[PDB]
A paper describes a structure:
However, the [name] mutation resulted in a steric clash with telaprevir's P2 moiety, causing the inhibitor to shift significantly; the inhibitor P2 moiety moved away from R155, losing van der Waals interactions with the protease. Notably, in the [name]-telaprevir complex the covalent bond between the ketoamide warhead and the catalytic serine was extended to greater than 2 Å, suggesting a reduced capacity for covalent modification, consistent with the large loss in potency against [name]. Thus, while telaprevir's flexibility allows adaptation to D168A, it cannot accommodate the disruption by R155K or [name]. Telaprevir and other linear ketoamide drugs select for [name] variants by direct steric clashes, while linear (BI 201335) and macrocyclic drugs (danoprevir, vaniprevir, TMC435) with large P2 moieties select for D168A variants by disrupting favorable stacking interactions with R155.
The HCV [name]/4A protease – a chymotrypsin-like serine protease – is a prime therapeutic target that cleaves four known sites along the virally encoded polyprotein. The [name]/4A protease also hydrolyzes two human proteins, TRIF and MAVS, which are part of the innate immune system, thereby confounding the innate immune response to viral infection. In this study, we report that four chemically representative protease inhibitors – telaprevir, danoprevir, vaniprevir and MK-5172 – exhibit distinct susceptibilities to the protease variants R155K, [name] and D168A. To elucidate the underlying mechanism by which chemically diverse inhibitors bind to the wild-type protease and drug-resistant variants, crystal structures were determined for 16 inhibitor-protease complexes. These complexes include wild-type protease and resistant variants R155K, D168A and [name] each bound to telaprevir, danoprevir, vaniprevir and MK-5172, with resolutions ranging from 1.10–2.50 Å; S139A protease variants were used except for telaprevir, which requires covalent bond formation with the serine 139 for efficient binding.
Numbering used by the authors: 982 to 1180
The structure:
């Protein structure tokens, strides 16, 4: 009974959204069997690159975004889980259920986005399928899609970035705002909220 007590696995990086060139595209770096093993050991020796990682638990796949040397994602996806790394599991450096926000030290090899300082309300959401979707900022933590999509389109994009025209991080996508299955808007965690969390 106490001896049969299992532990939750680590979050595992299973790919990335490549934003380095003219074309955004998703790359897978680990398959399902490797993911399952790595989640249990917490030992991930794969090379990490890029700003936006595709991450998985046993039950969910979603995104994580590096900003100012922290890999950030949503609490509703990651919970309090460690992330797998070459040295074994790494404990969260930030955990905030009230903001729906968690973060780990950014993996060696990752690149970070810089927080936006320009005040622009013309944003771009990067999805787990590497779509770059225009979003008009409508408040501190909400934006509207210029073209509404079924919510399926956004499933698994939580933890991904909203970017300004200059490619700086404005926020982390948290949840879709939907009506009868159509997403018309998105809620996000503003980068200023991350910056406060960091000090
Ligand atoms: C929504 C797309 C991204 C996913 N976000 C989520 O799953 C978040 C989580 C936040 C905590 C509760 C969950 C519900 N959720 C939602 O976005 C859900 N949105 C909602 O439930 C939104 N509510 C509504 O759309 C609504 C409200 N009244 C009546 C009818 N519909 C609320 C509205 C208030 C602000 C917050 C959003 C949705 C779209 C799935 C039904 C993300 O978790 C993800 O990447 N998923 C993949 C693994 C399956
Ligand atoms: Zn900016």
């Amino acid at each position: 009974h106490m001896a049969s007590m299992k532990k939750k696995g680590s979050v595992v990086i299973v790919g990335r959204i490549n934003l380095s060139g003219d074309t955004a595209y998703a790359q897978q770096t680990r398959g399902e069997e490797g993911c399952q093993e790595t989640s249990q050991t917490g030992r991930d020796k794969n090379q990490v690159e890029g700003e936006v990682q595709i991450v998985s638990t046993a039950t969910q796949t979603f995104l994580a975004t590096s900003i100012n040397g922290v890999l950030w994602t949503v609490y509703h996806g990651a919970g309090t889980r460690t992330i797998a790394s070459p040295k074994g599991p790494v404990t969260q450096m930030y955990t905030n259920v009230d903001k729906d926000l968690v973060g780990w030290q950014a993996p060696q090899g990752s690149r970070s986005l810089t927080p936006c300082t320009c005040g622009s309300s013309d944003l771009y959401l990067v999805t787990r399928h590497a779509d770059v979707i225009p979003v008009r900022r409508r408040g501190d933590s909400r934006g509207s899609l210029l073209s509404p999509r079924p919510i399926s389109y956004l499933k698994g994009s939580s933890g991904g970035p909203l970017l300004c025209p200059a490619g700086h991080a404005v926020g982390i996508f948290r949840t879709a705002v939907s009506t009868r299955g159509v997403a018309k808007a998105v809620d996000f965690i503003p980068v200023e909220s991350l910056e406060t969390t960091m000090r």
